[PDB]
Amino acid sequence: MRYGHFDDEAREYVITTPHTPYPWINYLGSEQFFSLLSHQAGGYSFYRDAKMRRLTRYRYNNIPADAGGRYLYVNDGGDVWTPSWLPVKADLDHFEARHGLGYSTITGERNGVRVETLFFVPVGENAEVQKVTVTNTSDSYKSLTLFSFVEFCLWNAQDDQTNYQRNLSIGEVEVEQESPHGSAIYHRTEYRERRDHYAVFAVNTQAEGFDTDRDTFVGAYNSLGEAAVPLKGESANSVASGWYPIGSHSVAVSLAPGESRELVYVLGYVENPDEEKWADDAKQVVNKERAHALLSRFATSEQTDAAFAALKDYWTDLLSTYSVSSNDEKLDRMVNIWNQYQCMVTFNMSRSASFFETGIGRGMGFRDSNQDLLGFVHLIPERARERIIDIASTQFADGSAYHQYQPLTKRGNNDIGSGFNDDPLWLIAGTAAYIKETGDFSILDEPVPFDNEPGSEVPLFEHLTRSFEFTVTHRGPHGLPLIGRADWNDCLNLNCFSTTPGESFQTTENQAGGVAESTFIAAQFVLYGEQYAELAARRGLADVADRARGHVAEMRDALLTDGWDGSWFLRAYDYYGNPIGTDAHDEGKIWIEPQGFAVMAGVGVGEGPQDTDAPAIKALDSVNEMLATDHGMVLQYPAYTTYQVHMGEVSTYPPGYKENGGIFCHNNPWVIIAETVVGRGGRAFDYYKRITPAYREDISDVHRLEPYVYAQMIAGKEAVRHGEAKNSWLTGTAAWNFVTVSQYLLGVRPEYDGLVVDPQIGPDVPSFTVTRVARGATYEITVTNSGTDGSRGRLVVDGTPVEGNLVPYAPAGSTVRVDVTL
């Protein structure tokens, strides 16, 4: 069943009940200031750093979930309710939440009073704004008091929830009931000491009263749903000193039948130069100049509406690079809106904060920085260029990489360190995709240091060479790359051997040496090793290119011999040289990552889809028979039913979850792309639909999480909860699925020398048109598609038939019409 509908015209997902299977959130903010916002107004906001700069507090694993957020308590003749339903849970006559791009609206109505709240983070502002419209929909007069509410965090969210021995004595506010445009509250904890910033929470009208102490507003022994002040009907005017600061104003609203009142609320982050921190000589009063300025920009509904308009303009203008129009509304909305929105949110949020990730850890995988780039580079190429230099600047001089990148300081994580041997090859993945999209070969000449050491600068190209050579110099007894701490699968730790709780599976190595190899890195090395070789050749390094190709050919041979189990690729050789992912074993017979990635790299592909004998086809057939389910493909089969001490974290999961039998959505695209490669477009599209939000909307009760974005993990067939997802929003599943559908299913993909048009989607999409803007020109690509396996597109370019699948790049400003038949 469903709990909402898509609104394609508005670019919103419309949630039509409070009673979803789980809280469904949206992300506000496109620059430095961000909010997490559930369909019940839950969540929080922070400036730049979700661990050290959080404005407002939020409780994970609360009972009930998501009780805490931006509330507006309506007191109507003594009856108290919130339009967000939570936390009060008073019966509503009407409820709706709409999540759009960078903004959401939530509307609740009860006993003749409707409250609609628009939430957004404006362009160019460090604030979350609410436009609130209160309407008397009854036939009688209403006289209301509305109590706003936000609970402040003491900035360092880790300290805030752990260091009470100090932090219950540090909470400080200032109250400004007569602000130039209404009433305002300032949360200024530790502004007295080292912080040059405070938060402001304010309303564009004179508040009848206020509260800044949570215990007084809520009352002893009460939940948020039973808050005492709203029930009493008057603000207690509480001034916090320590404990739990909050922001609340009471606003009197009197309405004739049918009449409406609009209010604008602002939660703002304000920083002052050090020399301008104080209003007074005694340094007791915060300088409010900047806060007043912000509040003056949102004093009226007209300013707020214009800011909202400017937000939509931003998203509408940003999403102008790739669209599709077909017979399939679900495909179209995923491609044009939601998949691309999600990719942008991953770039903005990294892996900081979701309703699963808690905002305390601040880095993301080095490998993930690169892969995320694959999905946003067509939208923000300038930013992508900068990200590539920033991450490559952290790389070690021997070619190895920090496993975790800290995007806020542009440094590698020193505690975690290096030794995950797939990491360095992803830098080649990132840079090639960047150069194919933009044509900007000049990024290869940028000066880039190693481990951020001044004076160590070499060309970015030289970094790619050190990434390539790292794998060459780190191969094991079969010529396969040594896996080291782990490969893409961070749970496959063959050099760990842990039997002590609390030891990190990723960084603990209780035995040194060994000969553990990865076929995943082999496959990766074949694919990105060739992309390196091509860049070396174009750079005019004919000898470097050719040597590189030689190493790639040897790796291809190794995969197809020592790496090949008979009907699929092995997964690895362990510390002692024993096979992993072989049919000789009872569990973990076939693993998905090699099968998809190796075939993506062309390994074992034969004459065409009918060539059953081809290793590539045997492997993908094996995947289909042993790993594919109704909800996508599981990571390996069978799942391990006992702890495998020589394999690290993988077997610690109960079967059917995460890396031990879960559908790890991120890797499903590699097989989908593999299927288009071998010429089985219908199978490819099928696998895509199995895990794609628009297509899973009909089973929201089984999926449970957001029906409009991808999740990392869907419980596999061996789990009782099979079909149920965890870890929505922040996952490279978004980039890889966007790459898959845009470039391989729809088949429109940037190349150095032109735009390739190679659709392989099968019969379910008989006709479609893609509009792609590439190198300053617009390509209108109309496809008539039989969907037959092995049939590839013949192109007519501007009315004239052409040979091959490559369209020459046209000059900036051009429009190019391409008709395709297959």
Ligand X SMILES: OC[C@H]1O[C@@H](O[C@H]2[C@H](O)[C@@H](O)[C@H](O)O[C@@H]2CO)[C@H](O)[C@@H](O)[C@@H]1O
Give residues in contact with ligand X (CB under 6 A): 166, 365, 367-368, 488-491, 649, 658-659
Alpha carbon distance 483, 504 (integer Å):
17
Find the angle CA(118)-CA(122)-CA(128) to the nearest 5 degrees: 60
Contacts of residue 552, Cβ cutoff 8 Å, sequence gap at least 6: 525, 526, 529, 530, 533
Residue 752 contact among ligand X, a copy of itself, none, beta carbon within 5 to 8 Å by kind: none
Number of residues that bind a copy of itself (CB under 8 A): 72
Residue 214 contact among a copy of itself, ligand X, none, beta carbon within 5 to 8 Å by kind: a copy of itself
Of 200 and 401, CB closest to ligand X: 401
By CB under 8 A, is residue 441 in contact with a copy of itself? no
Q: Which stretch binds a copy of itself (CB under 8 A): 202-210, 218-226, 308-316, 337-345?
A: 218-226
Contacts of residue 337, Cβ cutoff 8 Å, sequence gap at least 6: 8, 11, 101, 319
Site residues (CB under 8 A) for a copy of itself, limited to 521-540: none
Of these, 77, 180, 233, 242, which contacts a copy of itself (CB under 8 A)?
242
Nearest to 667 by CA among 658, 655, 678: 658
Nearest to 292 by CA among 176, 193, 173, 122: 176
Per-position b or e across 261-271, b if 16+ CB within 10 A of its CB:
bbbbbbbbbbe
Residue 681 token pair:
């477009």
Residue 727 contact among a copy of itself, ligand X, none, beta carbon within 5 to 8 Å by kind: a copy of itself
Binding mask 1-40 for a copy of itself (x = CB under 8 A): -----------------xx-x-------------------
By CB under 8 A, is residue 155 in contact with a copy of itself? yes
Of 149 and 564, CB closest to a copy of itself: 149
By CB under 8 A, is residue 169 in contact with a copy of itself? yes
Of these, 105, 238, 636, 651, which contacts a copy of itself (CB under 8 A)?
651
Q: Are 440 and 752 in contact (CB under 8 A)?
A: no
Residue 192: exposure state from Cβ atoms within 10 A (0-12, 13-18, ≥19): middle
Residue 154 token pair:
């003491």
Check if 490 is active-site: yes
Residue 367 contact among ligand X, a copy of itself, none, beta carbon within 5 to 8 Å by kind: ligand X
For the bound state, the minimum distance from the C-beta of residue 99 to a copy of itself, rounded and expressed in Å, comes to: 19
Residue 806 contact among a copy of itself, ligand X, none, beta carbon within 5 to 8 Å by kind: none
How many other CB atoms sit within 10 Å of the CB of residue 793? 20
For the bound state, the minimum distance from the C-beta of residue 40 to ligand X, rounded and expressed in Å, comes to: 28
DSSP code of 40?
T
By CB under 8 A, is residue 225 in contact with a copy of itself? yes
Of these, 417, 654, 754, 766, which contacts a copy of itself (CB under 8 A)?
654
Angle (deg, nearest 10), helices 423-438 and 381-392: 150
Cα separation values, 260 from 69, 112, 135, 144, 306, Å: 25, 12, 4, 12, 20
Of 521 and 719, CB closest to a copy of itself: 719
Residue 365 contact among ligand X, a copy of itself, none, beta carbon within 5 to 8 Å by kind: ligand X
Nearest to 745 by CA among 797, 677, 816: 677
How far is Cα of residue 95 from the mean position of the Cα atoms in its chain? 28
Binding mask 50-79 for a copy of itself (x = CB under 8 A): --x------xxxxxx--xx-----------
By CB under 8 A, is residue 48 in contact with a copy of itself? no
Residue 736 token pair:
């890889």
For the bound state, the minimum distance from the C-beta of residue 158 to a copy of itself, rounded and expressed in Å, comes to: 9
Binding mask 357-396 for a copy of itself (x = CB under 8 A): xx-xx-----------------------------------
For the bound state, the minimum distance from the C-beta of residue 166 to ligand X, rounded and expressed in Å, comes to: 4
By CB under 8 A, is residue 658 in contact with a copy of itself? yes
Q: Are 248 and 210 in contact (CB under 8 A)?
A: yes
Tokens 């609206």 identify what position? 105
Query: Strand 245-255 to strand 800-802: parallel, antiparallel, or no bridges (unpaired)?
Result: unpaired
Residue 488 contact among a copy of itself, ligand X, none, beta carbon within 5 to 8 Å by kind: ligand X
Q: Are 40 and 69 in contact (CB under 8 A)?
A: yes
Site residues (CB under 8 A) for a copy of itself, limited to 452-511: 498-503
By CB under 8 A, is residue 218 in contact with a copy of itself? yes
Cα separation values, 718 from 371, 581, 626, 654, 724, Å: 29, 18, 12, 9, 12
Sign of CA dihedral 238, 242, 244, 245: positive
Residue 356 contact among a copy of itself, ligand X, none, beta carbon within 5 to 8 Å by kind: a copy of itself
Residue 490 contact among a copy of itself, ligand X, none, beta carbon within 5 to 8 Å by kind: ligand X
* Phi/psi-derived region of residue 182, left when phi > 0, alpha when psi is between -120 and 50, beta in every other case: left
Of 57 and 589, CB closest to a copy of itself: 57
Residue 456 contact among ligand X, a copy of itself, none, beta carbon within 5 to 8 Å by kind: none
For the bound state, the minimum distance from the C-beta of residue 395 to a copy of itself, rounded and expressed in Å, comes to: 26
Of these, 117, 248, 582, 727, which contacts a copy of itself (CB under 8 A)?
727
Of these, 16, 32, 133, 223, which contacts a copy of itself (CB under 8 A)?
223
By CB under 8 A, is residue 409 in contact with a copy of itself? no
DSSP states of 442-503 as a string? GGGGSEE-STT-TT--EEHHHHHHHHHHHHHTSB-TTSSBB-BT-SSSTT--TT----STT-
Q: Which stretch binds a copy of itself (CB under 8 A): 154-162, 393-401, 594-602, 619-627?
A: 154-162
DSSP code of 657?
B
For the bound state, the minimum distance from the C-beta of residue 675 to a copy of itself, rounded and expressed in Å, comes to: 28
Q: Which helix (H) or strand (E) holds 795?
A: strand 794-797
The separation between the first and the last C-alpha atoms of the chain, rounded to the nearest angstrom, is: 37
Cis preceding linkage at 87, omega within 30:
yes
Binding mask 171-210 for a copy of itself (x = CB under 8 A): -x-----------------x-xxxx---------------
Residue 81 contact among a copy of itself, ligand X, none, beta carbon within 5 to 8 Å by kind: none
By CB under 8 A, is residue 673 in contact with a copy of itself? no
Catalytic residue among 211, 490, 574, 758: 490
Active site residues: 490
